[PDB]
Amino acid sequence: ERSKLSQEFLYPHLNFPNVKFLRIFISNVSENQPWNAT
């Protein structure tokens, strides 16, 4: 009870981990530009 907050009991949870993983894409698509503006 005294050490509920120390990261020694919180950081890794190899049996039931705490985080999910999200992937983000950044893009742009130039279309029909001089070859107006998209």
């Binding site: 020694e8 890794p12 190899l14």
Partner: protein
């Protein structure tokens, strides 16, 4: 005769506590698991 009665009563008394030892033996498994978890953390922090 009375001495034999005494011995039986005392053995009956001992049996109950000898049975009660097992739960205290299970708390040891709890402690063992917690120690292994702390070891997980130490390993990963050393790698970090």
């Amino acid at each position: 005769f009375l001495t034999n009665e005494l011995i039986r009563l005392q053995m009956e008394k001992l049996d109950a506590k000898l049975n009660h030892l097992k739960k205290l033996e299970k708390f040891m498994e709890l402690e063992r698991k917690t120690l292994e978890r702390q070891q997980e953390n130490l390993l990963i922090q050393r790698l970090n």
